[PDB]
Design a protein around this ligand. Structure first.
Ligand SMILES: [K+]
Ligand SMILES: [K+]
Lengths: 523, 523
């Protein structure tokens, strides 16, 4: 009986700056087959071939005998998203480049000429884009033929038809600017159309506070196609005479004041605490020697320069709380001009609760009333209707987002019908934004939500849209961006009236940016 | 305990090439204390000050409040032995240099001028040697006084008196020559006095075979003071057309044929097996497509150049075995000229057993008879009496080395009285060598043994000596080299008649070499 070539097409971001991106994985258990001669690939008729730099065929060897029958399509991860300075190209010890076509036409014949191991053989196709490719590029392709021993082999494709591969930008890769890792994205759009992406700069490792951590900022003036040199809006160094690794600041949240175009970044500055996690090393009290400090930096020049830190802890923290901080990601300006950041606090019973913090005087003073729900942490807030705030919350009970609304800035809360039902989660950060009819090309109020669409692990990062104020999230109104494993956090914004932007922790880069046409999500 | 300065002196190798080495750790829980001002350090009168470049005082901040009762002396590891390119100097985000004295005299005055955190404060003293320091350098020192608020503070020292700090050489540091890690040391001395140290070059990570692994070799012609550029006696690259990471070779063992000065390195070449562990991926058979290959490289020019691989699997592997490989470390030449390497094999029931393979014809042919003991793995062999081989084995039953002897090259074995009693272990590689009276300065037959002297974890690397063929290992005949945590493998050799050499995985470098006067061990 003939050997079958199994094909799995990927559904992960193709990074424009990467030298390799995994497009297809092939697996052949060679019982009769002696040689794989060539693979024939055909790109879709609508693909812009001028944006493609190269297509490559790699051989990645065999599998351990105990793993036969587990349906793996690779023996190992081919391209690192963690090794500093080694995240742009395939690890050459794992994959052998058999052939490559630079500036291909729509039909590509990739010469393998690979004698097969008597057993499982892994191959894959790498796609490399030109550095200037459009972020709205979609790539589709089919493997048409695989020639084995000078005959067309039987094929079986396990992945779905009509995959649209999307490109992206790795705004931050592991190792960039001397930092081991980047985590915890926030993203907003200024009134000038400028994109501001913030994140933790985790210099020593990927671990959470306490550690040597700054808040970094990447600024783009061309819709996310290019990003300016990293800025550091918040950084505490050797403040108070303690080492820099005992002065981390992180979990940033960004908002743009739409009335003035002033941008605010809020984060948690942790002082002391040895090398332990702030989540259980911040204690009751008010000063830096006991408890995490809530600090702001503002920019009045469209994100180019940033103020010294403004410590607002004494305005909003109850002394008996262990830890008050922002919900990472972004905040909002309400229609009436109120600025709002989601927040979370570990109360005096050591239980975390989400809520909101607001300012009615353009960020000069801030107020918190009551929590929305017990035993919740990271949350994002959206003005779903004028004067009605919806808080969408990470819930420690597991499995699904909690949702509540308030009409009085968090004095009182009402459980939403979608709560603990509509949006499954693995207990992870999620992004929520509201986009009003006046501001988007669909002329409909929409909610957009992003998270790992799973209840276990962090994978299948998905943007979901709701047309009925978050009551329903229809399957047809969703785009799955990244099937791979990552750290899972994401943040949304509108790039313009027709286009969604997302900054997130992906399987391919610590900070990944993608642009998605709104009409691709809601067709 | 408040306002007492607690002191812990380290017992770890001082690497000659490091810019920092941790010599003392200080902890002060400051209740009444406001500033730590001045620390006075006095080196022992026998210390060679000309070999010391500088002494530094670092402040490393505070501790998490939940750990105040745990009696730690640091908040974090100060100097990495794992981060590529960053293993030579204190991480400056963890430690602030408050004071430094270059070209010190015997009495050193360090001025901290450090305002104290209201709570735990950590300080430490760094010792930096001059590049040409002697390997037999011993350094002793005492903290004489610590001034807090311009008064001499109460001091309490928790570490023992009369610590002799030894220097060492980091033959390989994580990241050297493009390799993430180095593991599994072997060490021998040629008839010319040349030191040959071998190890795994684990390019991608510290993970065991299968992976991209070569056998590396460092050669020293000056007693271990300096080491020549790394050689690669065994490396298989893309053999058979598989990726380099499916062609690893490792767990080397080295022996010098004392009759001819030819040096032999034996290692296990694993071909295929995906990215899984060879221990569970090698299967019965003889071909490279099924089972690990036992390969040799020889040097007939005092270790300078190495033959192409010699595959001896067919001579010594039983087809029914899952896996045959050498015991890592070294082999020997018996008095009568027989070459012997320890080995281990996973038999058809998938149980490992240690034994020996030998050659009576200068390495042309090799033979294995019977295992010494079931459910044993890594072992080292020594000729404890003429014609009597002692095999000292890692025993999966836990807690202690197994020991057996054979008078017929492994046809029959006798359990030694010391077996499973005399030498505790955490189930780890251990080194054993025999040194005849005529070959050392004491004119006594001795055995030397090194391992992590513990039943839990890999730390307290210790050299032990025996005068009665391993029946007794007296406490006074031991030197503890490294109290820190590491990967635990070690290998001994005689540098010359007066001096022991050890190459090992230490808490300060992946491949650490130290030279120890024999009379320091058996006084
Ligand atoms: K509109
Ligand atoms: K052979």
């Amino acid at each position: 009986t003939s050997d079958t070539v199994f094909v799995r097409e990927t559904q992960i971001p193709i990074l424009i700056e990467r030298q390799d991106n995994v497009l297809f994985m092939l697996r052949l258990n060679a019982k009769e087959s002696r040689s794989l001669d060539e693979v024939v690939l055909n790109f879709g008729k609508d693909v812009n071939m001028a944006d493609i730099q190269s297509v490559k065929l790699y051989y990645s060897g065999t599998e351990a005998r105990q793993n036969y029958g587990k349906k793996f399509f690779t023996p190992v991860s081919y391209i690192s998203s963690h090794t500093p300075g080694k995240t742009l190209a395939a690890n050459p010890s794992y994959s052998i480049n058999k052939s490559q076509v630079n500036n291909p036409g729509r039909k590509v014949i990739l010469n393998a000429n690979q004698k097969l191991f008597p057993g499982i053989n892994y191959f894959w196709i790498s796609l490399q884009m030109k550095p200037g490719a459009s972020l709205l590029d979609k790539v589709s392709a089919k493997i048409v033929t695989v020639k084995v021993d000078n005959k067309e082999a039987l094929m079986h494709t396990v992945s779905p038809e009509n995959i649209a591969h999307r490109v992206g930008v790795g705004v931050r890769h592991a190792g960039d600017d001397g930092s081991a890792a980047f985590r915890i994205p926030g993203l907003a759009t200024t009134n000038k159309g400028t994109l501001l992406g913030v994140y933790d700069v985790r210099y020593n490792s990927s671990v959470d506070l306490q550690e040597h951590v700054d808040v970094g900022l990447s600024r783009s003036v061309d819709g996310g196609k290019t990003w300016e040199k990293m800025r550091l809006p918040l950084a505490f160094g050797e403040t108070g005479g303690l080492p820099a690794a005992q002065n981390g600041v992180g979990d940033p949240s960004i908002l743009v004041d739409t009335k003035t175009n002033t941008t605010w970044v809020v984060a948690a500055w942790t002082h002391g605490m040895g090398n332990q996690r702030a989540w259980w090393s911040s204690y009751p009290g008010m000063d830096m020697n006991h408890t995490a400090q809530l600090v702001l930096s503002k920019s009045t020049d469209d994100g180019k320069t940033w103020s010294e830190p403004i410590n607002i802890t004494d305005q909003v923290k109850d002394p008996s709380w262990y830890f008050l901080l922002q919900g990472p990601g972004r905040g909002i300006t309400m229609q009436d001009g109120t600025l709002v950041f989601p927040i979370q606090f570990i109360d005096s019973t050591r239980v975390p609760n989400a809520g909101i913090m607001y300012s009615k005087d353009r960020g000069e003073t801030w107020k918190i009333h009551n929590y929305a729900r017990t035993n919740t942490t990271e949350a994002q807030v959206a003005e779903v209707e004028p004067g009605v705030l919806m808080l969408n919350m990470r819930d420690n009970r597991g499995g699904s987002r909690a949702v509540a609304t308030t009409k009085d800035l968090g004095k009182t809360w009402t459980e939403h019908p979608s709560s603990r039902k509509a949006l499954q989660e693995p207990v992870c950060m999620a992004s929520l934004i509201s986009v009003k009819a006046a501001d988007n090309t669909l002329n409909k109020d929409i909610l957009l939500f992003s998270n790992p669409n799973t209840v276990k692990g962090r994978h299948h990062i998905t943007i979901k849209a709701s047309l009925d104020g978050g009551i329903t999230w229809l399957p047809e109104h969703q785009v799955m961006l990244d099937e791979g494993d990552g750290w899972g956090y994401s943040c949304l914004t509108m790039i313009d009236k027709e286009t969604v932007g997302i900054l997130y922790e992906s399987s391919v880069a610590h900070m990944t940016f993608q642009a998605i046409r709104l009409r691709d999500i809601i067709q």
